[PDB]
């Protein structure tokens, strides 16, 4: 009967509950069923919950949604939209305002002496996007820093603010939620690198939900936001009304995942040729498929 | 080594070869391999050839492409484009110019006394599209005519012209190729019903072709038409340069196939309720999936 709604650990539950509870209470009123929040210590807990039918619908990032579609019987059906009109969000590297580091060059030059707060291994902005553009494209490794730990966006931002880690990954959403959870902390941060645009986060359901359940859920998302009270709830989440979506929104993250695999395989001093060819062509086939799909979407 | 290119039986081979041979000769010159035409007596022969790896690439209609994707390891990668700027093509019912039948009402009123040339069971414009809008939506059957045979578009158009069958399915492309194959025959035809727009026909390859083969084929299609001689070959096929495409172009035909299944199941005097519900909801789940996908494409 009750629905379980998975919420990724971008922030503490303490900070998430006040944004999410009124939304899930509105969902309950409209679906006529109980809706329970499902949290986990990392993104993998939501994906695994969905794989085992313990999570029915979830808010994911694009990378964790990709893994849920591939591994957890997931399907995207809606996309979040920034309340401020931004067309997606961006990944960043942050250091403290008192750091003499001002750009990626200065960072990489001193990496052996600096501690690094990397993201959740399933985070688009926390892990994959800096993982390709900062590390892979520079032929370096998070292991090349003095010390590295993985943590969620809120933990990383506060550790940099609090001078507990020298640099960390983060994102522009999470930085804006600092204006709420922790404002004098935002003033202690300085962005030294910003990614290309990342698409807005998907909402995903498990494909084995009934037809009538999906229709009710989809109607709820597509129509949410039409009243004053729903507008106020979206505003607190940092969102405008949702957009219809599909697994096609994941293409640029699939591409980025294969690009990282490619830049890795090609920077790999430890394969021969019969075998750097075989692996290169297998990743290339997949990239070609996504390029052709993109060409098709463009020409529609 | 050699590629087999499947060509659906919209016309006789006698009429197809002069349009197709120069195109396939240009393909050979560019791919540096032999390209052989693969014909069959009906569309099913091309789909089955692809299923058994005897056909590598094919020009299909949307319905036969749907069946090849579902059954024959096919994938759409390009779409044909009308040389005259039309945005797709249309299905028709034709009678002879000397018939007193002028519209679908007159036709259906006298159907018990008329012979009917239906299309190839795998033809979009010959079978499925009139099958839903003419027959299913009118709660009637091709069995309700005096006699019915299935035949390809050219055979049907000539039989109506030649006063050998009273009415037949056809399409606006095939009628325009009559201006070429058989002009005084076109003057003997009268269109009494026209469908909504059908998307342009896809070109499809089998998914197990190598990465380098697909890249060469795709490059050939995307770039064809840039020279005088290639323009002349496309013009003879009735085409402009190709458009990048994907399996997403098949959505409206998938929908139409499910609509026909639905109108059938709901006009079915011979199921109970526990069972008109179970089948109705299964077809509805699929239609809902395609509606959601359409909503997503629209909102991109």
PDB file of C-alpha atoms in Angstrom, chain A residues 110-282:
ATOM      1  CA  UNK A 110      50.520  21.834  -4.660  1.00  0.00           C
ATOM      2  CA  UNK A 111      48.385  18.684  -4.573  1.00  0.00           C
ATOM      3  CA  UNK A 112      50.970  16.508  -2.688  1.00  0.00           C
ATOM      4  CA  UNK A 113      50.597  18.859   0.343  1.00  0.00           C
ATOM      5  CA  UNK A 114      46.810  19.249   0.278  1.00  0.00           C
ATOM      6  CA  UNK A 115      43.896  17.163   1.635  1.00  0.00           C
ATOM      7  CA  UNK A 116      41.003  16.403  -0.743  1.00  0.00           C
ATOM      8  CA  UNK A 117      37.322  15.896   0.076  1.00  0.00           C
ATOM      9  CA  UNK A 118      36.023  13.839  -2.812  1.00  0.00           C
ATOM     10  CA  UNK A 119      32.382  13.145  -3.276  1.00  0.00           C
ATOM     11  CA  UNK A 120      30.073  10.220  -2.999  1.00  0.00           C
ATOM     12  CA  UNK A 121      31.248   7.660  -5.660  1.00  0.00           C
ATOM     13  CA  UNK A 122      27.760   7.783  -7.094  1.00  0.00           C
ATOM     14  CA  UNK A 123      27.458  11.594  -7.284  1.00  0.00           C
ATOM     15  CA  UNK A 124      27.428  13.320 -10.684  1.00  0.00           C
ATOM     16  CA  UNK A 125      28.825  16.684  -9.429  1.00  0.00           C
ATOM     17  CA  UNK A 126      30.724  15.205  -6.414  1.00  0.00           C
ATOM     18  CA  UNK A 127      32.651  12.504  -8.199  1.00  0.00           C
ATOM     19  CA  UNK A 128      32.183  11.819 -11.890  1.00  0.00           C
ATOM     20  CA  UNK A 129      32.312  15.310 -13.356  1.00  0.00           C
ATOM     21  CA  UNK A 130      35.479  16.475 -11.474  1.00  0.00           C
ATOM     22  CA  UNK A 131      36.741  12.941 -11.890  1.00  0.00           C
ATOM     23  CA  UNK A 132      36.884  13.460 -15.666  1.00  0.00           C
ATOM     24  CA  UNK A 133      37.573  17.180 -16.138  1.00  0.00           C
ATOM     25  CA  UNK A 134      39.897  17.801 -13.214  1.00  0.00           C
ATOM     26  CA  UNK A 135      41.656  14.399 -12.751  1.00  0.00           C
ATOM     27  CA  UNK A 136      41.362  12.301 -15.911  1.00  0.00           C
ATOM     28  CA  UNK A 137      41.971  15.206 -18.318  1.00  0.00           C
ATOM     29  CA  UNK A 138      45.011  16.109 -16.248  1.00  0.00           C
ATOM     30  CA  UNK A 139      46.380  12.551 -16.060  1.00  0.00           C
ATOM     31  CA  UNK A 140      46.207  12.618 -12.283  1.00  0.00           C
ATOM     32  CA  UNK A 141      44.418  10.822  -9.480  1.00  0.00           C
ATOM     33  CA  UNK A 142      42.706  11.746  -6.195  1.00  0.00           C
ATOM     34  CA  UNK A 143      45.510   9.418  -4.797  1.00  0.00           C
ATOM     35  CA  UNK A 144      47.952  12.135  -5.858  1.00  0.00           C
ATOM     36  CA  UNK A 145      46.692  14.394  -3.024  1.00  0.00           C
ATOM     37  CA  UNK A 146      48.191  14.164   0.515  1.00  0.00           C
ATOM     38  CA  UNK A 147      44.993  12.493   1.788  1.00  0.00           C
ATOM     39  CA  UNK A 148      41.540  11.951   0.328  1.00  0.00           C
ATOM     40  CA  UNK A 149      38.185  11.033   1.823  1.00  0.00           C
ATOM     41  CA  UNK A 150      34.785  10.609   0.230  1.00  0.00           C
ATOM     42  CA  UNK A 151      31.844  12.488   1.733  1.00  0.00           C
ATOM     43  CA  UNK A 152      28.534  14.055   0.698  1.00  0.00           C
ATOM     44  CA  UNK A 153      28.157  17.658  -0.551  1.00  0.00           C
ATOM     45  CA  UNK A 154      27.077  19.194   2.783  1.00  0.00           C
ATOM     46  CA  UNK A 155      29.862  17.462   4.751  1.00  0.00           C
ATOM     47  CA  UNK A 156      32.457  18.610   2.161  1.00  0.00           C
ATOM     48  CA  UNK A 157      31.286  22.221   2.099  1.00  0.00           C
ATOM     49  CA  UNK A 158      31.301  22.484   5.898  1.00  0.00           C
ATOM     50  CA  UNK A 159      34.772  20.775   6.129  1.00  0.00           C
ATOM     51  CA  UNK A 160      36.242  23.320   3.718  1.00  0.00           C
ATOM     52  CA  UNK A 161      34.495  26.234   5.573  1.00  0.00           C
ATOM     53  CA  UNK A 162      35.721  24.854   8.907  1.00  0.00           C
ATOM     54  CA  UNK A 163      39.318  24.486   7.622  1.00  0.00           C
ATOM     55  CA  UNK A 164      39.239  20.718   8.117  1.00  0.00           C
ATOM     56  CA  UNK A 165      40.047  19.774   4.492  1.00  0.00           C
ATOM     57  CA  UNK A 166      41.929  21.939   1.985  1.00  0.00           C
ATOM     58  CA  UNK A 167      39.827  21.409  -1.113  1.00  0.00           C
ATOM     59  CA  UNK A 168      36.637  19.514  -1.938  1.00  0.00           C
ATOM     60  CA  UNK A 169      34.127  18.835  -4.685  1.00  0.00           C
ATOM     61  CA  UNK A 170      30.689  20.373  -4.428  1.00  0.00           C
ATOM     62  CA  UNK A 171      27.958  21.902  -6.583  1.00  0.00           C
ATOM     63  CA  UNK A 172      26.074  25.127  -7.132  1.00  0.00           C
ATOM     64  CA  UNK A 173      22.796  23.793  -5.742  1.00  0.00           C
ATOM     65  CA  UNK A 174      24.363  22.630  -2.475  1.00  0.00           C
ATOM     66  CA  UNK A 175      26.155  25.920  -2.218  1.00  0.00           C
ATOM     67  CA  UNK A 176      22.830  27.720  -2.526  1.00  0.00           C
ATOM     68  CA  UNK A 177      21.333  25.521   0.186  1.00  0.00           C
ATOM     69  CA  UNK A 178      24.081  26.856   2.399  1.00  0.00           C
ATOM     70  CA  UNK A 179      22.540  30.140   2.231  1.00  0.00           C
ATOM     71  CA  UNK A 180      19.792  28.409   4.192  1.00  0.00           C
ATOM     72  CA  UNK A 181      21.391  25.723   6.385  1.00  0.00           C
ATOM     73  CA  UNK A 182      24.627  27.574   7.160  1.00  0.00           C
ATOM     74  CA  UNK A 183      25.055  31.081   5.893  1.00  0.00           C
ATOM     75  CA  UNK A 184      28.236  32.331   7.562  1.00  0.00           C
ATOM     76  CA  UNK A 185      29.764  29.132   6.249  1.00  0.00           C
ATOM     77  CA  UNK A 186      29.126  30.082   2.631  1.00  0.00           C
ATOM     78  CA  UNK A 187      31.150  33.248   3.197  1.00  0.00           C
ATOM     79  CA  UNK A 188      34.141  31.056   4.108  1.00  0.00           C
ATOM     80  CA  UNK A 189      34.148  29.316   0.685  1.00  0.00           C
ATOM     81  CA  UNK A 190      35.790  30.186  -2.643  1.00  0.00           C
ATOM     82  CA  UNK A 191      35.065  28.362  -5.906  1.00  0.00           C
ATOM     83  CA  UNK A 192      38.282  27.687  -7.905  1.00  0.00           C
ATOM     84  CA  UNK A 193      36.818  25.493 -10.713  1.00  0.00           C
ATOM     85  CA  UNK A 194      33.388  25.109 -12.247  1.00  0.00           C
ATOM     86  CA  UNK A 195      32.202  22.359 -14.625  1.00  0.00           C
ATOM     87  CA  UNK A 196      30.186  22.520 -17.805  1.00  0.00           C
ATOM     88  CA  UNK A 197      26.423  22.449 -17.258  1.00  0.00           C
ATOM     89  CA  UNK A 198      24.944  19.312 -15.773  1.00  0.00           C
ATOM     90  CA  UNK A 199      21.240  18.527 -16.523  1.00  0.00           C
ATOM     91  CA  UNK A 200      18.679  18.889 -13.836  1.00  0.00           C
ATOM     92  CA  UNK A 201      18.196  15.841 -11.555  1.00  0.00           C
ATOM     93  CA  UNK A 202      15.712  13.168 -12.534  1.00  0.00           C
ATOM     94  CA  UNK A 203      12.898  11.592 -10.556  1.00  0.00           C
ATOM     95  CA  UNK A 204      12.816   7.847 -11.117  1.00  0.00           C
ATOM     96  CA  UNK A 205      10.374   5.033 -10.367  1.00  0.00           C
ATOM     97  CA  UNK A 206      10.820   1.283 -10.361  1.00  0.00           C
ATOM     98  CA  UNK A 207       9.332  -0.186 -13.572  1.00  0.00           C
ATOM     99  CA  UNK A 208       7.348  -2.929 -11.795  1.00  0.00           C
ATOM    100  CA  UNK A 209       4.974  -0.520 -10.114  1.00  0.00           C
ATOM    101  CA  UNK A 210       1.406  -1.016 -11.377  1.00  0.00           C
ATOM    102  CA  UNK A 211      -0.041   0.995 -14.349  1.00  0.00           C
ATOM    103  CA  UNK A 212      -2.475   2.856 -12.085  1.00  0.00           C
ATOM    104  CA  UNK A 213       0.253   3.670  -9.530  1.00  0.00           C
ATOM    105  CA  UNK A 214       2.487   5.133 -12.229  1.00  0.00           C
ATOM    106  CA  UNK A 215      -0.410   7.123 -13.651  1.00  0.00           C
ATOM    107  CA  UNK A 216      -1.179   8.606 -10.200  1.00  0.00           C
ATOM    108  CA  UNK A 217       2.449   9.391  -9.468  1.00  0.00           C
ATOM    109  CA  UNK A 218       3.020  10.965 -12.893  1.00  0.00           C
ATOM    110  CA  UNK A 219      -0.127  13.104 -12.624  1.00  0.00           C
ATOM    111  CA  UNK A 220       1.001  14.279  -9.189  1.00  0.00           C
ATOM    112  CA  UNK A 221       4.422  15.399 -10.439  1.00  0.00           C
ATOM    113  CA  UNK A 222       3.204  17.009 -13.659  1.00  0.00           C
ATOM    114  CA  UNK A 223       0.533  19.054 -11.847  1.00  0.00           C
ATOM    115  CA  UNK A 224       2.396  19.926  -8.665  1.00  0.00           C
ATOM    116  CA  UNK A 225       3.020  23.586  -8.063  1.00  0.00           C
ATOM    117  CA  UNK A 226      -0.301  25.027  -9.292  1.00  0.00           C
ATOM    118  CA  UNK A 227      -1.374  26.374  -5.907  1.00  0.00           C
ATOM    119  CA  UNK A 228       0.191  28.805  -3.432  1.00  0.00           C
ATOM    120  CA  UNK A 229       1.061  26.219  -0.920  1.00  0.00           C
ATOM    121  CA  UNK A 230       2.693  23.888  -3.522  1.00  0.00           C
ATOM    122  CA  UNK A 231       4.641  26.804  -4.925  1.00  0.00           C
ATOM    123  CA  UNK A 232       5.978  27.529  -1.424  1.00  0.00           C
ATOM    124  CA  UNK A 233       7.045  23.823  -0.985  1.00  0.00           C
ATOM    125  CA  UNK A 234       8.855  23.827  -4.362  1.00  0.00           C
ATOM    126  CA  UNK A 235      10.548  27.100  -3.519  1.00  0.00           C
ATOM    127  CA  UNK A 236      11.946  25.582  -0.334  1.00  0.00           C
ATOM    128  CA  UNK A 237      13.340  22.655  -2.384  1.00  0.00           C
ATOM    129  CA  UNK A 238      14.896  25.290  -4.748  1.00  0.00           C
ATOM    130  CA  UNK A 239      12.686  24.063  -7.616  1.00  0.00           C
ATOM    131  CA  UNK A 240      10.157  25.345 -10.159  1.00  0.00           C
ATOM    132  CA  UNK A 241       7.412  22.990 -11.407  1.00  0.00           C
ATOM    133  CA  UNK A 242       8.710  19.643 -12.769  1.00  0.00           C
ATOM    134  CA  UNK A 243       9.329  18.849 -16.399  1.00  0.00           C
ATOM    135  CA  UNK A 244       8.220  15.642 -18.207  1.00  0.00           C
ATOM    136  CA  UNK A 245      11.316  13.532 -18.730  1.00  0.00           C
ATOM    137  CA  UNK A 246      12.693  10.116 -19.732  1.00  0.00           C
ATOM    138  CA  UNK A 247      15.898   8.062 -19.746  1.00  0.00           C
ATOM    139  CA  UNK A 248      17.025  10.222 -22.665  1.00  0.00           C
ATOM    140  CA  UNK A 249      18.076  12.954 -20.249  1.00  0.00           C
ATOM    141  CA  UNK A 250      20.870  10.645 -19.079  1.00  0.00           C
ATOM    142  CA  UNK A 251      22.679  10.607 -22.404  1.00  0.00           C
ATOM    143  CA  UNK A 252      25.263  13.328 -21.599  1.00  0.00           C
ATOM    144  CA  UNK A 253      26.146  11.530 -18.332  1.00  0.00           C
ATOM    145  CA  UNK A 254      26.449   8.200 -20.107  1.00  0.00           C
ATOM    146  CA  UNK A 255      28.719   9.981 -22.539  1.00  0.00           C
ATOM    147  CA  UNK A 256      30.786  11.513 -19.740  1.00  0.00           C
ATOM    148  CA  UNK A 257      31.129   8.063 -18.074  1.00  0.00           C
ATOM    149  CA  UNK A 258      32.435   6.554 -21.311  1.00  0.00           C
ATOM    150  CA  UNK A 259      34.726   9.547 -21.900  1.00  0.00           C
ATOM    151  CA  UNK A 260      36.302   8.903 -18.497  1.00  0.00           C
ATOM    152  CA  UNK A 261      36.603   5.190 -19.319  1.00  0.00           C
ATOM    153  CA  UNK A 262      38.210   6.171 -22.674  1.00  0.00           C
ATOM    154  CA  UNK A 263      40.683   8.776 -21.262  1.00  0.00           C
ATOM    155  CA  UNK A 264      41.574   6.178 -18.715  1.00  0.00           C
ATOM    156  CA  UNK A 265      42.124   3.288 -21.153  1.00  0.00           C
ATOM    157  CA  UNK A 266      44.179   5.568 -23.454  1.00  0.00           C
ATOM    158  CA  UNK A 267      46.305   6.960 -20.544  1.00  0.00           C
ATOM    159  CA  UNK A 268      46.856   3.280 -19.507  1.00  0.00           C
ATOM    160  CA  UNK A 269      50.558   2.479 -19.728  1.00  0.00           C
ATOM    161  CA  UNK A 270      49.692  -1.178 -18.930  1.00  0.00           C
ATOM    162  CA  UNK A 271      47.750  -2.692 -21.831  1.00  0.00           C
ATOM    163  CA  UNK A 272      49.304  -3.887 -25.102  1.00  0.00           C
ATOM    164  CA  UNK A 273      47.853  -2.948 -28.624  1.00  0.00           C
ATOM    165  CA  UNK A 274      45.608  -5.973 -29.477  1.00  0.00           C
ATOM    166  CA  UNK A 275      44.046  -5.039 -26.139  1.00  0.00           C
ATOM    167  CA  UNK A 276      44.110  -1.243 -25.972  1.00  0.00           C
ATOM    168  CA  UNK A 277      42.287  -1.648 -29.428  1.00  0.00           C
ATOM    169  CA  UNK A 278      39.665  -4.191 -28.238  1.00  0.00           C
ATOM    170  CA  UNK A 279      38.694  -2.057 -25.184  1.00  0.00           C
ATOM    171  CA  UNK A 280      38.928   1.253 -27.049  1.00  0.00           C
ATOM    172  CA  UNK A 281      36.621   0.022 -29.841  1.00  0.00           C
ATOM    173  CA  UNK A 282      34.083  -1.402 -27.286  1.00  0.00           C
TER     174      UNK A 282
END
